[PDB]
């Protein structure tokens, strides 16, 4: 009904992809989210935190 | 990403088809055509030509 062609790169499970996938549990009702304090939206607000370094590293 | 289904008739090389196919030599520049005299556009203008038949077919 449509002339498809297998492009090179089929049947490979790439560990970093955003393809679709079927849902195992359909018709499901999601518990709605609440306002938990301290919402980290992005990883770069952890390196922007005042943190202590260790300095003295003698054998003792 | 799309629910495809293999119709019956896949992976068969039919000798008479007009499917697509990838191009082996891309980005190529075609030599432009010129006006060659005697342009046969169709096979039925060869049977419309006055041609001789052989008639006598004796052993000698």
């Amino acid at each position: 009904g449509l002339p498809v062609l297998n492009t090179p790169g089929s049947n490979q499970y790439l560990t970093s992809d955003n393809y679709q996938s079927p849902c195992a549990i359909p018709e499901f009702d999601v518990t709605p989210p609440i306002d938990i304090p301290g919402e980290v939206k992005n990883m770069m607000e952890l390196a922007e935190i005042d943190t202590m370094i260790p300095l003295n590293l003698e054998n003792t | 990403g799309l629910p495809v289904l293999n119709t019956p008739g896949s992976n068969q090389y039919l000798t008479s088809d007009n499917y697509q196919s990838p191009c082996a030599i891309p980005e190529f520049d075609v030599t432009p055509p010129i006006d060659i005299p005697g342009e046969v556009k169709n096979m039925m203008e060869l049977a419309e030509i006055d041609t001789m038949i052989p008639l006598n077919l004796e052993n000698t």
Binding site: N18, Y19, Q20, P22, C23, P26, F28, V30 | L2, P3
Partner: peptide, 17 residues
């Protein structure tokens, strides 16, 4: 240049980012 996006499933959580 943008691209074409269609969520092909009636489920919500089976999409991509």
């Amino acid at each position: 240049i943008n691209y074409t996006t269609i969520n092909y499933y009636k489920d919500s959580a089976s999409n991509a980012a």
